[PDB]
Structure 1
Amino acid sequence: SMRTLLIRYILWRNDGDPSYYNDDFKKLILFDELVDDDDVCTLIKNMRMTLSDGPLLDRLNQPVNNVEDVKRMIAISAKVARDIGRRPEIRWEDSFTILFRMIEKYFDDLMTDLY
């Protein structure tokens, strides 16, 4: 389940808790190269995020046409999740709804690329 893997991965990028580290995350961390750290606060402002939002990727109005675009969206989710801080108000369910709507069609292409 790419749903299960990606939820676990983003939540771990958010809290950085080493007791929730998993080897399954290693190939996902490599996608970080697709996003510059210095653009993160720009991506956050473009998604008009409040303190109670996770990544709201649909608000970037960037197309998802292929597996490379999925990797970028995962990378944006990871770095945003990283920089917004370990905060209880974050409505992760809304963030994952948006993410999976945008990328689920390419789950097949993603699993081929990972494995």
Structure 2
Amino acid sequence: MRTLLIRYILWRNDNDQTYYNDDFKKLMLLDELVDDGDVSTLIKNMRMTLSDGPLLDRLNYPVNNIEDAKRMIAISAKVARDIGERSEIRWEESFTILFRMIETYFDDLMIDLY
């Protein structure tokens, strides 16, 4: 789950066909859980501050249920997409926080998705 999620988020960023996998299709369904307006707001802030700061702030939100986790994956995915591949983001820092929150839900997320 850790690997798959890293691979998926990175893929959402650059859209490199050479790194696409069909397991991404299921994870892509989680996008409906996140409003595009929230993503736009987040991107605007990231650009305003020239940092992943606003993304890390969103990732530092509490995760109390699997739906909360699904949303964090989706927000990471849509931000990754919308920010653009040129964006010099230290992705491992975002993954550190994302997984710090969602790690426990990995077993259930895997069942829920596949």
1:84 maps to which residue? 83
Choose between structure 1 and 2: higher helix proportion: 2
Number of residues paired by the alignment?
112
The aligned runs of 1:51-90 (5 Å cut-off) are 51-53=50-52, 55-56=55-56, 59-60=57-58, 62-87=61-86, 89-90=88-89
TM-score by length of 2: 0.85
Unaligned regions of 5+ residues in structure 1, if any?
Answer: none
Q: Deviations over 1:35-93 (max 9, x none)?
A: 1222213234677985452831xx23632111111110000000000111102621011
> Tell me, what secondary structure is at the counterpart of 2:23?
helix
Which amino acid counterpart does residue 103 of structure 1 have in structure 2? I
Higher RCO (CA < 8 A, seq sep 6+): 2
Q: 1:80 to 1:102 in 2, by over 3 A?
A: same
Contact residue 53 and residue 90 of structure 1 kept, 8 A: yes
> Tell me, what secondary structure is at the counterpart of 1:106?
helix
